[PDB]
Amino acid sequence: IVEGSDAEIGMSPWQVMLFRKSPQELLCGASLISDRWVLTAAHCLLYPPWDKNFTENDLLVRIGKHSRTRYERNIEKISMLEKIYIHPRYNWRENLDRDIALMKLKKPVAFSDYIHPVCLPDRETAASLLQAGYKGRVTGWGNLKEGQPSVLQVVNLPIVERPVCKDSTRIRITDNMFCAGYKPDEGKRGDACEGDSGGPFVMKSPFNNRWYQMGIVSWGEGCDRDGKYGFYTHVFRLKKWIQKVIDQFG
Amino acid sequence: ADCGLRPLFEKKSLEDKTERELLESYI
Amino acid sequence: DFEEIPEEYL
C-alpha cells in the first residue's frame, strides 16, 4: 500500500496472508468469507508468463495477523488448504479478466477478536455502493513504494468512473473489473502495490453497518502514479460462480 | 450470519479512525 | 526476514 497508514488491531479481521512454505515468503493477501473459505486473485496461484502454478501443498494461509513477518503466537491461525478453485474463464493471457479463486481449508477456523468473516455483496448492496465517488478500503502487507511495512497498512480510495478507467490505460478493461484511486487533480494519493494482490477492497454499508467485500486487488501499472488507477476484480459480477462452487464443493 | 460485524468495533459500538471518511462519501 | 513458524505447520 502506498500513502496508507498502519491498520488498528482487529480492523480487518478477514485479512489473510498467502504464505509460501519454501522458501517461506508472502505471496499475496486474501479474505476470510466463512470459516472454511478464503477468496483471492486467481493470478496469485496461476500465472504462466511468470512460471507461477501453485498447488494446495505449496501454501499456508495465515489468519489474524497484524505483523508482516513475526509469527503471532496465540493470535494468528495458520491453516492448510484442502482445495484450490480457480475461475474457469480466468484470462491470464490478456488482461487478468475474472481474476478470482476460492480456497477450501483443511478445517474450519475459529472466530476470535482478530479473525472474523467479511460479507459478500448482494445485488442491491452492490447497486447502491458501487458508485463513482464512493470510497472503499484496501489492506495489505504490500510495498510502500513503487518498502515493506512492519504491520498491515490501510488506505481509503474513491471508485472512479469506467470511462476514466478505460482512458488511463492500453489494457482492455471488462465488466468484471472496476478501478479506484484519486485524480491527479484531487490531490490526495494512495493505491495498492505489488504484494497487496488478492486482498480485499471492502465497503461498510450505511443500511446495516456491515462490511462487504466489493473487490480483490488485481493489477495496475506502477503504484500511485498520477493519472493511473488500481484495478480490482468485481466480486458481485462473479458471485454466481462463487455461490455455485460453495454448494457443489461444500 | 455474523459477517462483517467486527468484534472490536461494530460489536462494541466503537468506530475506527477512518471509517467515517467512507460513510461521508456515500454522501 | 520472516520469523520461522512452528513445524507442525509444515
Ligand SMILES: *[C@@](O)(C(=O)NCCc1ccccc1)[C@H](CCCNC(=N)N)NC(=O)[C@@H]1CCN2CC[C@@](N)(Cc3ccccc3)C(=O)N12
Ligand atoms: C500484486 O500484488 C502481485 O501479484 N504481486 C506479485 C506477487 C508479489 C507478492 C509479494 C510481493 C510482491 C509481489 C500486483 C498488484 C498490483 C496493484 N497495483 C496497483 N494498484 N498500482 N499484481 C500484479 O502485479 C499483476 C500480476 C501479473 N502482472 C502483470 C503486469 C501488471 N503490472 C500489469 C498488467 C495487468 C494485466 C495484464 C498485463 C499487465 C500487473 O499488475 N500484474
Ligand code: NA
Ligand atoms: Na485505453
Ligand code: NA
Ligand atoms: Na494514481
